[PDB]
């Protein structure tokens, strides 16, 4: 069901493992819920995101159609920000020290 | 035999504005496992329940309902997507 | 340097480390070139992408500004599809056996 | 300043069936580095060469030619995609 993939597939799989971990944590183990999102931002992303209080806007950006579910494609919207912020947070001069 | 038996209260499938549609997904082969509520066309984050009661269905509540029951052998087993929608004032049946 | 990050940062870090590996392969250790793009698609992504032949259409969909440098945000467009295929490549019935 | 000087022998761009188009991609500012060949509509799998000679161009050899040269100050940038296409029997120049 999740056998060792190729070099470029294991990179993305690493994210999937974490995603599935918090997904199966509660009901609807297909995606993440708003509760998990809240906890993830403030408890797991205080170092990643500069804002852990106004998660509403970030959450709504993925909610969009009032899905209230961090499913595929929509959750990618945040992933694209995360994978970008981890590198261009403020490292335009220096950050990843 | 069916891996996932999608039994709806209104056998017709379509109801009137504000109608109540109960989605009952059972398994006539194995004990009721983790049923994932999936709806083709804006899926709702509803908790795994065998009987989903959706009363007063509105225009946005419409959609093809499917129940992904995680069996022992058949893990992510989807069912027949039933087009639960709203029609003009009347009853199917 | 890339110091030990959090559970939600290490997941995306794996993508960054692998990315930098190809980024420092050619000139301009920051973005991937068309060479690396083709080399990845037709070698490190034959199990990931269902198409290893056509790449000019997908590439130009990334850097629509004609950069030929798969950098941050630009390459994100492909990263999102990659992270999507790992979940909906063709698993509408069975793919990840 | 021209970072990528793409000079084609037949400046007309469009040629006749079986025409010979020489693609020269160099830099009049910095020394000629690793010039990768890029062509929309399926690129040609040829080694990074400053002068690409394509004789007897067939109907399937058409496409926009661009040179992705790895610059020292900048990086591997593209260029103006010259649409090398085949037209009616005649010469353009």
Curated annotation (Swiss-Prot), chains A, C:
<dbReference type="GO" id="GO:0043303">
    <property type="term" value="P:mast cell degranulation"/>
</dbReference>
<protein>
    <recommendedName>
        <fullName>Protein S100-A13</fullName>
    </recommendedName>
</protein>
<feature type="binding site">
    <location>
        <position position="69"/>
    </location>
    <ligand>
        <name>Ca(2+) 2</name>
    </ligand>
</feature>
<dbReference type="GO" id="GO:0005509">
    <property type="term" value="F:calcium ion binding"/>
</dbReference>
<dbReference type="GO" id="GO:0008270">
    <property type="term" value="F:zinc ion binding"/>
</dbReference>
<comment type="function">
    <text>Plays a role in the export of proteins that lack a signal peptide and are secreted by an alternative pathway. Binds two calcium ions per subunit. Binds one copper ion. Binding of one copper ion does not interfere with calcium binding. Required for the copper-dependent stress-induced export of IL1A and FGF1. The calcium-free protein binds to lipid vesicles containing phosphatidylserine, but not to vesicles containing phosphatidylcholine.</text>
</comment>
<keyword id="KW-0653">Protein transport</keyword>
<dbReference type="GO" id="GO:0005730">
    <property type="term" value="C:nucleolus"/>
</dbReference>
<dbReference type="GO" id="GO:0005886">
    <property type="term" value="C:plasma membrane"/>
</dbReference>
<feature type="binding site">
    <location>
        <position position="31"/>
    </location>
    <ligand>
        <name>Ca(2+) 1</name>
    </ligand>
</feature>
<keyword id="KW-0813">Transport</keyword>
<keyword id="KW-0186">Copper</keyword>
<dbReference type="GO" id="GO:0001819">
    <property type="term" value="P:positive regulation of cytokine production"/>
</dbReference>
<dbReference type="GO" id="GO:0005507">
    <property type="term" value="F:copper ion binding"/>
</dbReference>
<dbReference type="GO" id="GO:0050786">
    <property type="term" value="F:RAGE receptor binding"/>
</dbReference>
<keyword id="KW-0964">Secreted</keyword>
<dbReference type="GO" id="GO:0005576">
    <property type="term" value="C:extracellular region"/>
</dbReference>
<keyword id="KW-0597">Phosphoprotein</keyword>
<dbReference type="Pfam" id="PF01023">
    <property type="entry name" value="S_100"/>
</dbReference>
<keyword id="KW-0446">Lipid-binding</keyword>
<dbReference type="GO" id="GO:0005737">
    <property type="term" value="C:cytoplasm"/>
</dbReference>
<dbReference type="GO" id="GO:0005615">
    <property type="term" value="C:extracellular space"/>
</dbReference>
UniProtKB/Swiss-Prot annotation, chains B, D:
<protein>
    <recommendedName>
        <fullName>Advanced glycosylation end product-specific receptor</fullName>
    </recommendedName>
</protein>
<comment type="function">
    <text>Cell surface pattern recognition receptor that senses endogenous stress signals with a broad ligand repertoire including advanced glycation end products, S100 proteins, high-mobility group box 1 protein/HMGB1, amyloid beta/APP oligomers, nucleic acids, histones, phospholipids and glycosaminoglycans. Advanced glycosylation end products are nonenzymatically glycosylated proteins which accumulate in vascular tissue in aging and at an accelerated rate in diabetes.</text>
</comment>
<comment type="subunit">
    <text>Constitutive homodimer; disulfide-linked. Forms homooligomers. Interacts with S100A1 and APP. Interacts with S100B, S100A12 and S100A14. Interacts with TIRAP. Interacts with HMGB1. Interacts with LGP2; this interaction plays an important role in AGER-mediated pro-inflammatory responses and cytokine release. Interacts with double-strand break repair protein MRE11 which is a core component of the MRN complex. The interaction enhances MRE11 endonuclease activity and promotes DNA repair.</text>
</comment>
<feature type="domain" description="Ig-like C2-type 2">
    <location>
        <begin position="1"/>
        <end position="83"/>
    </location>
</feature>
């Amino acid at each position: 069901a999740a056998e060792p993939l190729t070099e470029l597939e294991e990179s993305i799989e690493t994210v999937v493992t974490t995603f599935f971990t918090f997904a199966r944590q509660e009901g609807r183990k297909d995606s993440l819920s708003v509760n998990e999102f809240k906890e993830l931002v403030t408890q797991q992303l205080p170092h990643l995101l500069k804002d852990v209080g106004s998660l509403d806007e970030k959450m709504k950006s993925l909610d969009v159609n009032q899905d209230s579910e961090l499913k595929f494609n929509e959750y990618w919207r945040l992933i694209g920000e995360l994978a970008k912020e981890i590198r261009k947070k403020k490292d335009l001069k220096i950050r990843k020290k | 035999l069916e891996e996932v038996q999608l039994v709806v209260e209104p056998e017709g499938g379509a109801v009137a504005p504000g109608g109540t549609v109960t989605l009952t997904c059972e398994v006539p082969a194995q004990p009721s496992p983790q049923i994932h509520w999936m709806k083709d066309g804006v899926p709702l984050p509803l908790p795994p329940s065998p009987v989903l009661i959706l009363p007063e269905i509105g225009p946005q509540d419409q959609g093809t309902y499917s129940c992904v029951a995680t069996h022992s052998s058949h893990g992510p087993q989807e069912s027949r997507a039933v087009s639960i929608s709203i029609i003009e004032p009347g009853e199917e049946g």
